[PDB]
Design a protein around this ligand. Structure first.
Ligand SMILES: CC(=O)N[C@H]1[C@@H](O)[C@H](O)[C@@H](CO)O[C@@H]1O
Ligand SMILES: CC(=O)N[C@H]1[C@@H](O)[C@H](O)[C@@H](CO)O[C@@H]1O
Ligand SMILES: [Zn+2]
Ligand SMILES: [Zn+2]
Lengths: 269, 269
């Protein structure tokens, strides 16, 4: 049908009309860095004005833990210090069409999985390495969300018990070491990108041995970066082969959240 | 019905008759430390002689990755250097009754989960801290095994990228830092047990944020050790509360593999 898709990230908000699977009227605005609550409300109202009368429903792919129309920030530092935002309510102010909501990496995992050889890939993870580090887990071709929408927050699993404190409050999260935010927090060389890639290869090994994942797609601004995937591949062959699996770049690229949310909201009516 | 249960571990083999859910004729013999292939065959044949004519089926809970009647050792050092053993075949030499096979921690996870408030606990993990470190994952009240029987090998996820090399070939596995084998590999103080408990609290945090686990049961010789659980609990409250969940000791104790395998083999006919 006709979908209004939002992809709220810590750095960018995207928006588009997914119609019969195709992205039409793409926009991309900065995510507010200050006055964030006021800013999120103005941005959502603007974006909903722009697409007035062209959608049957609203699908939202949002960074953070999404449960009961509420965005809870595991890492408030991705959302400009914001802890929580009444995401569905704020959107319902502007339309009475249905509104469905999903974590941003869960939505992207749904998108990329649709492109899988469904019978020979039943356990699949998509990893975003962008502003933060996010993930989604499909197991027996079912997307995990959890009772609370937490499933997939693989960026806040342990990369190093002696590493930086993460913005979530935990020490040594993968996101605290590998993410875009973590990379440019130190640069203010090549060796920086390697530390990020090695941490992501450890996370891949972890998900393989823990969940018997058969395939992993990598996305996000850092993940899709020319040369990154090959660096993660190089670190994966230090492991015993049992930890290896095939890694490919996300094929929807930066649109995977839009299409995933659009198709996910539809496909669980 | 009438079940012959085997619980093959890196240090002990147990055996018993599970009948109508109760353990009867328990035995426990050392797991061979040398001449291991010959030893595993003699032990299985002995144990099968002892219980001749008293079982309808054989349920095997085995350390290692269990796929197609074959035990593959992720950490051969737990099985006295053994890499692989034709586990189901060796047992089929002595009976024509059916033989079902499961990882040892997957079986125990099945046991302990049966004691859960099924509606309010749908995502559950059981962690063994014994000879090695093992685990099983229940998600939407379904035990994960994987296409290859790997799901649950949480002992070989990352605890420290600068820690000991694990016997699996990977550096810094949880098992390489927290396990019984890892503890007594250094002692040859209190601070040792703490390092083990802290690593296990990081693993608990990991499984909670990654899979939205609602409850975790701890088992095994180290896990059930007087004072260990409280030490893991103490390390869990250093984390933001989102990573916390309720931890209780395994209630079947050292019989969870026997009953789990017995009931699992039956319950997926
Ligand atoms: C606001 C927030 O805490 N986002 C999480 C996680 O939900 C996101 O998926 C990830 C990437 O978007 O960044 C962060 O790790
Ligand atoms: C032989 C072997 O590699 N066993 C694994 C794992 O399968 C077991 O569950 C764990 C505890 O039994 O030890 C080891 O980590
Ligand atoms: Zn974190
Ligand atoms: Zn290991």
């Amino acid at each position: 049908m006709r979908c209004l898709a939002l992809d709220i990230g810590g750095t960018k908000i995207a928006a588009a009309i997914v119609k019969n699977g195709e992205i039409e009227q793409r926009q991309q605005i900065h995510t507010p860095r200050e006055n964030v609550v006021e800013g999120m409300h103005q941005a959502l109202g603007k974006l909903l004005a722009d697409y007035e009368g062209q959608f049957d429903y609203v699908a939202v792919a949002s960074t953070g833990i999404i449960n009961n129309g509420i965005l809870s920030a595991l890492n408030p530092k991705n959302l400009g210090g914001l802890a929580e935002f009444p995401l569905k309510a704020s959107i319902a102010k502007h339309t009475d069409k249905p509104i469905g909501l999903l974590n941003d990496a869960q939505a992207a995992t749904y998108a990329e999985y649709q492109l899988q050889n469904f019978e020979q890939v039943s356990n699949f993870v998509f990893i975003t390495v962008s502003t933060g580090v996010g993930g989604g887990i499909v197991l027996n071709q079912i997307l995990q969300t959890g009772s609370r929408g937490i499933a997939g927050h693989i960026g806040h699993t342990l990369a190093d018990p002696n590493g930086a404190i993460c913005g979530c409050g935990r020490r040594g999260c993968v996101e605290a070491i590998a993410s875009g935010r973590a990379i440019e927090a130190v640069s203010s060389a090549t060796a920086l990108v390697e530390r990020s890639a090695k941490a992501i290869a450890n996370l891949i090994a972890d998900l393989v041995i823990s969940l018997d994942i058969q395939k992993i797609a990598i996305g996000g601004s850092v993940g899709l970066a020319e040369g990154y995937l090959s660096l993660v591949e190089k670190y994966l062959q230090d492991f015993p082969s049992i930890y290896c699996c095939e890694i490919e770049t996300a094929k929807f690229g930066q649109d995977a959240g839009l299409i995933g949310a659009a198709y996910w909201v539809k496909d669980v009516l």
